[PDB]
Amino acid sequence: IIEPSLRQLAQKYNCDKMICRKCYARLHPRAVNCRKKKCGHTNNLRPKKKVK
Amino acid sequence: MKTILSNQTVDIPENVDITLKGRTVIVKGPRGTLRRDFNHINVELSLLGKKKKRLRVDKWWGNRKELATVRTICSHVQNMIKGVTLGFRYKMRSVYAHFPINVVIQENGSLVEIRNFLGEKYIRRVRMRPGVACSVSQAQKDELILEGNDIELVSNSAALIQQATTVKNKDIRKFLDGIYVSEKGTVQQA
Amino acid sequence: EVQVLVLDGRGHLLGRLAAIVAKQVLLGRKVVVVRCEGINISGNFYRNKLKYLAFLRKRMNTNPSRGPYHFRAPSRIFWRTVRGMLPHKTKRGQAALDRLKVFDGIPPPYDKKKRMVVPAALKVVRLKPTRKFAYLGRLAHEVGWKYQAVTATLEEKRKEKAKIHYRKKKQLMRLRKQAEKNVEKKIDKYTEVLKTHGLLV
Amino acid sequence: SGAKFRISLGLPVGAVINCADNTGAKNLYIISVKGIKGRLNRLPAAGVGDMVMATVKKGKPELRKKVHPAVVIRQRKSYRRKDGVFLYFEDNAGVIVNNKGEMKGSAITGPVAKECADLWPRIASNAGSIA
Amino acid sequence: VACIGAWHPARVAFSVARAGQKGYHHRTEINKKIYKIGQGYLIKDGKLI
RNA sequence: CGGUUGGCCUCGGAUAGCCGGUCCCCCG
RNA sequence: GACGUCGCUUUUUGAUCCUUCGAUGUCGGCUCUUCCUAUCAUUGUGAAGCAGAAUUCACCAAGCGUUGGAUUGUUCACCCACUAAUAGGGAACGUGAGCUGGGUUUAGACCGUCGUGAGACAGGUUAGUUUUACCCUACUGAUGAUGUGUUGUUGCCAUGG
RNA sequence: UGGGCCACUUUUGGUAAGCAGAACUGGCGCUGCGGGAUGAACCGAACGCCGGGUUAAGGCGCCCGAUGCCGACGCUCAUCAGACCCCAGAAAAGGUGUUGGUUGAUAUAGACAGCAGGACGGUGGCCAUGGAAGUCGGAAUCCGCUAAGGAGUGUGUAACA
Numbered sequence: 025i026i027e028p029s030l031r032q033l034a035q036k037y038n039c040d041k042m043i044c045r046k047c048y049a050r051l052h053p054r055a056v057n058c059r060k061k062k063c064g065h066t067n068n069l070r071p072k073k074k075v076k
Numbered sequence: 077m078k079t080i081l082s083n084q085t086v087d088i089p090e091n092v093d094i095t096l097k098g099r100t101v102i103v104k105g106p107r108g109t110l111r112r113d114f115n116h117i118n119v120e121l122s123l124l125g126k127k128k129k130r131l132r133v134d135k136w137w138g139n140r141k142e143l144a145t146v147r148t149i150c151s152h153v154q155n156m157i158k159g160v161t162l163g164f165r166y167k168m169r170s171v172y173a174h175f176p177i178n179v180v181i182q183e184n185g186s187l188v189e190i191r192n193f194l195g196e197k198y199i200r201r202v203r204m205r206p207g208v209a210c211s212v213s214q215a216q217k218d219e220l221i222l223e224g225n226d227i228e229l230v231s232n233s234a235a236l237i238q239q240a241t242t243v244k245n246k247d248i249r250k251f252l253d254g255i256y257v258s259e260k261g262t263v264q265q266a
Numbered sequence: 267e268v269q270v271l272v273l274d275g276r277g278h279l280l281g282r283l284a285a286i287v288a289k290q291v292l293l294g295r296k297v298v299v300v301r302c303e304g305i306n307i308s309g310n311f312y313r314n315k316l317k318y319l320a321f322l323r324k325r326m327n328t329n330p331s332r333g334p335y336h337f338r339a340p341s342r343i344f345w346r347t348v349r350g351m352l353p354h355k356t357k358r359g360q361a362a363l364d365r366l367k368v369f370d371g372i373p374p375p376y377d378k379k380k381r382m383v384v385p386a387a388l389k390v391v392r393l394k395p396t397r398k399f400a401y402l403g404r405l406a407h408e409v410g411w412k413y414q415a416v417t418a419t420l421e422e423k424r425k426e427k428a429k430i431h432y433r434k435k436k437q438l439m440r441l442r443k444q445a446e447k448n449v450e451k452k453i454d455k456y457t458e459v460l461k462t463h464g465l466l467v
Numbered sequence: 468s469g470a471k472f473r474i475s476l477g478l479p480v481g482a483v484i485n486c487a488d489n490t491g492a493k494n495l496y497i498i499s500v501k502g503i504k505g506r507l508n509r510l511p512a513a514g515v516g517d518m519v520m521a522t523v524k525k526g527k528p529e530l531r532k533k534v535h536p537a538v539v540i541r542q543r544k545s546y547r548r549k550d551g552v553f554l555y556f557e558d559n560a561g562v563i564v565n566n567k568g569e570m571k572g573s574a575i576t577g578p579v580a581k582e583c584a585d586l587w588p589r590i591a592s593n594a595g596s597i598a
Numbered sequence: 599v600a601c602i603g604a605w606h607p608a609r610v611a612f613s614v615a616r617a618g619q620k621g622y623h624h625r626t627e628i629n630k631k632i633y634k635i636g637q638g639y640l641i642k643d644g645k646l647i
Numbered sequence: 648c649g650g651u652u653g654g655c656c657u658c659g660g661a662u663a664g665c666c667g668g669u670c671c672c673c674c675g
Numbered sequence: 676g677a678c679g680u681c682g683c684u685u686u687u688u689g690a691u692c693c694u695u696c697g698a699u700g701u702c703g704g705c706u707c708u709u710c711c712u713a714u715c716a717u718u719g720u721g722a723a724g725c726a727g728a729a730u731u732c733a734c735c736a737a738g739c740g741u742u743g744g745a746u747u748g749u750u751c752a753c754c755c756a757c758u759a760a761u762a763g764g765g766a767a768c769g770u771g772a773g774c775u776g777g778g779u780u781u782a783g784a785c786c787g788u789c790g791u792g793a794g795a796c797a798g799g800u801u802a803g804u805u806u807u808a809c810c811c812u813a814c815u816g817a818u819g820a821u822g823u824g825u826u827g828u829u830g831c832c833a834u835g836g
Numbered sequence: 837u838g839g840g841c842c843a844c845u846u847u848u849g850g851u852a853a854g855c856a857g858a859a860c861u862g863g864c865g866c867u868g869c870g871g872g873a874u875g876a877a878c879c880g881a882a883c884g885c886c887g888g889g890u891u892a893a894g895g896c897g898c899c900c901g902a903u904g905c906c907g908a909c910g911c912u913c914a915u916c917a918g919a920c921c922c923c924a925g926a927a928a929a930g931g932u933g934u935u936g937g938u939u940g941a942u943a944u945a946g947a948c949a950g951c952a953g954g955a956c957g958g959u960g961g962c963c964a965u966g967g968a969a970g971u972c973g974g975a976a977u978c979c980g981c982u983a984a985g986g987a988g989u990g991u992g993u994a995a996c997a
């Protein structure tokens with residue numbers, strides 16, 4: 025019964041992201057390279073899966 | 077490759093008065109005053125006008141990594157100017173599925189206490205940064221209004237509160253409860 | 267030169283100051299280095315802290331009481347760097363190591379003296395200004411030095427007393443300028459002698 | 468509510484105590500104690516109120532060659548009881564239970580320690596006396 | 599103690615068990631609750647304890 | 648047992664900035 | 676992660692024969708300390724085909740813990756059971772002037788196979804002396820030494836844990 | 837004396853080896869000295885006992901003789917930097933970290949990025965009704981009555997969404 029506007033707010037902060045395939049870092053949805061020095065700033069990313 | 081000169085300029089309105097004590101900016105508009113020390117960056121700052129009041133920042137033989145700092149300094153000064161003219165307000169909404177999040181504002185808008193986050197008995201208390209005032213909105217139901225002059229202090233307080241209400245050992249694609257920044261506006265809107 | 271050479275450690279780079287001090291103290295020249303908590307190290311604070319913690323890890327695992335002694339005060343850290351640059355297993359190097367003396371802050375045989383500066387070890391001269399550096403006092407305090415607050419308050423006291431003495435000296439200099447303007451008519455004969463030979467622009 | 472205080476154990480693994488209910492067992496041979504993380508060379512041991520894994524050495528044949536959970540109800544070893552008094556029993560005795568504490572039998576012969584009677588309400592119901 | 603260290607740190611370490619002095623040791627124990635503070639043997643009259 | 652062959656009795660510091668001196672406000 | 680391909684490690688077994696045959700005590704267990712991390716658990720996290728519960732994959736991380744038994748000389752193994760978990764290794768394949776001596780591996784003896792035989796067997800079996808520290812160091816404790824004239828009391832904390 | 841060993845290049849067996857075996861020259865053995873921190877063999881140079889001068893290889897912050905030159909031009913920041921023959925430690929693969937370069941492309945008939953309007957249609961022709969009067973594994977593909985528009989790469993779909 026959670027309002028869709030607040031639901032898309034919480035999804036903007038928790039669900040709409042990219043994950044780095046090499047390290048698993050949570051990156052902003054327009055990312056091309058990962059920010060972490062651990063993975064060497066790789067461009068091997070995937071979106072974050074959705075419960076939908 | 078070192079560019080000979082990289083520079084850009086900030087316009088200053090009439091009601092603000094700024095002073096430069098070296099690499100130290102004091103901004104003096106109507107909603108108070110602000111002050112920022114930029115002595116970790118090698119630039120030169122200059123006031124130009126006598127009735128138009130431009131502010132130039134100059135870089136003078138920098139490479140790329142230090143040519144970024146020119147636009148960064150100018151954006152910081154523009155945020156200071158906006159903070160003393162209009163002042164920053166962050167509206168953040170509380171989002172819950174089952175347990176209503178009860179927020180109480182202790183002394184003079186400087187402390188926030190979240191009680192029933194996810195039905196837990198632990199009461200989390202976040203101290204606001206000095207010069208940031210939090211309040212409960214009257215226009216909408218479950219919404220904090222936190223205002224100030226420093227964008228860094230206001231946004232860091234909002235992020236503090238937001239990372240305070242965080243969900244652990246659960247699905248954060250479900251369990252979407254928290255308090256999230258809905259919009260970053262100003263006061264007086266002009 | 268038979269007097270003691272008193273250096274101010276604030277603003278200096280550790281190993282460069284240590285190399286200068288080591289060659290001086292081998293050549294003779296009793297050297298005091300005060301304010302070793304103000305010594306800088308190039309490279310960022312974290313990697314300097316990690317270098318010190320790796321040094322702390324180095325330990326004789328049969329008898330750590332016999333093992334390498336990790337001194338924590340910034341004065342003793344500087345002293346151990348100069349020790350590393352000296353030939354300290356010989357009588358000559360031991361005599362030089364005794365000829366050197368180091369302090370945190372400025373103790374009061376030396377707070378009322380003129381401190382010198384080594385520009386070949388200064389941070390503003392030897393580092394690019396867009397580079398990270400660390401503070402020996404902060405590094406020492408986070409690897410286990412106990413006395414950075416008491417040193418700070420004593421240095422604040424010393425700075426207040428130095429401000430008072432400096433204001434006295436400025437009033438004396440103003441009086442001396444006033445006295446020249448008063449009796450210039452009887453030293454005009456002597457003033458032109460000095461101007462002729464390059465003193466007194 | 469309330470958790471049991473520590474008592475003196477004195478009933479190690481290889482112990483043979485006597486079965487104190489009407490199940491048809493006579494002996495209980497302890498092989499384990501429920502809740503022992505243990506230590507090098509230290510034998511796991513039990514006291515009154517402890518659930519143990521036990522075999523029955525003599526008794527009924529449909530009980531004999533198995534492992535059952537059991538609860539120790541009487542120990543010959545003296546234990547302080549925190550009102551000062553040290554208490555001990557004449558024998559060592561335990562009853563066969565299931566995993567959730569229900570007795571396999573229906574009636575307990577002899578006294579049952581209070582340190583297990585408050586822990587196991589189904590055991591204390593079948594007891595005759597709480598010593 | 600049947601074995602004091604391996605072959606090759608080539609020394610007995612400071613952390614193996616050895617014989618020597620037991621007791622007469624300086625210790626500092628904390629959280630000792632005071633139950634009662636006495637009053638001594640005062641004399642008002644034929645006295646009272 | 649030997650060395651030694653005038654002294655410096657002191658601001659804090661900044662380094663894309665400093666130092667000195669005066670006319671009008673404030674500090675018992 | 677198939678077809679391919681690049682590595683690391685020296686806890687496997689080889690390959691080699693540099694050191695040692697005027698001798699470095701040769702398996703395993705027991706005992707005891709320390710180290711490593713290629714993390715089983717626990718702390719803090721990120722991911723999921725993560726609803727919860729359970730689990731799986733990663734990261735910082737070796738602080739702390741990682742057990743009681745049956746059988747076998749066993750290392751390995753397998754099972755019973757408890758557990759937060761029952762992780763993996765190194766230190767002259769740690770550790771015999773620390774033990775033990777079950778195995779192996781002298782001399783006694785039996786069996787099987789082989790040999791005409793004396794005898795052999797990396798096949799089975801049984802019985803078979805485990806010596807010395809008082810030296811130096813290390814370590815554990817115990818007196819003391821070195822300057823402050825002597826001596827005492829009360830104290831500080833460098834450094835090590 | 838008839839045990840040799842090592843190095844450039846050539847070379848046999850071997851996954852390889854400080855492995856085994858050859859050819860050629862030099863060395864070490866039989867050889868000290870300067871340098872390579874340390875080292876039989878590397879680099880320089882071979883030695884009676886000394887003074888002066890100068891060098892080789894190698895160096896010149898300090899240990900430690902010598903840059904205490906107002907040395908030149910750049911590159912590089914590492915929360916495992918890097919640092920000199922033999923030589924004493926790393927690869928495939930990556931990086932929107934920064935620096936240089938090669939080639940191609942677009943742009944005042946106004947680029948790129950952002951503020952935005954019509955930004956769509958019979959024809960879904962065909963395909964397929966378990967799928968299209970938008971967005972579908974298949975072969976497909978036209979004209980739109982258009983300042984420019986599909987048999988869409990956009991609106992998670994049988995859907996007029």
Ligand SMILES: COC(=O)c1c(OC)cc2cc3c(c(O)c2c1C)C(=O)[C@]1(OC)C(=O)C=C(OC)[C@@H](O)[C@]1(O)C3=O
Nearest residue numbers: 698700701776778779780781782783802803804805806
């Ligand atoms: C293989 O396990 C051994 O290492 C070992 C051993 O392990 C305890 C004990 C001994 C004992 C002995 C011998 C050993 O060789 C021996 C060996 C090799 C002998 O040779 C001996 O002289 C000493 C001798 O010459 C005459 C006899 O038999 C002819 C022996 O009994 C003897 O007397 C003796 O005592």
Ligand SMILES: [Mg+2]
Nearest residue numbers: 147151152154
């Ligand atoms: Mg901006």
Ligand SMILES: [Mg+2]
Nearest residue numbers: 245246247725
């Ligand atoms: Mg879960």
Ligand SMILES: [Mg+2]
Nearest residue numbers: 507508509705
């Ligand atoms: Mg045992």
Ligand SMILES: [Mg+2]
Nearest residue numbers: 692693694695
């Ligand atoms: Mg060999």
Ligand SMILES: [Mg+2]
Nearest residue numbers: 692693855856
């Ligand atoms: Mg050979």
Ligand SMILES: [Mg+2]
Nearest residue numbers: 695696698699
């Ligand atoms: Mg031998």
Ligand SMILES: [Mg+2]
Nearest residue numbers: 695697698699
């Ligand atoms: Mg020998």
Ligand SMILES: [Mg+2]
Nearest residue numbers: 698699700772
């Ligand atoms: Mg021997």
Ligand SMILES: [Mg+2]
Nearest residue numbers: 605699700767
């Ligand atoms: Mg030996």
Ligand SMILES: [Mg+2]
Nearest residue numbers: 712714735736
């Ligand atoms: Mg790790």
Ligand SMILES: [Mg+2]
Nearest residue numbers: 613737738739
């Ligand atoms: Mg510990």
Ligand SMILES: [Mg+2]
Nearest residue numbers: 767768769770
């Ligand atoms: Mg061994």
Ligand SMILES: [Mg+2]
Nearest residue numbers: 605770771773
């Ligand atoms: Mg031994």
Ligand SMILES: [Mg+2]
Nearest residue numbers: 700771772805
């Ligand atoms: Mg022995």
Ligand SMILES: [Mg+2]
Nearest residue numbers: 776777778803
């Ligand atoms: Mg035997």
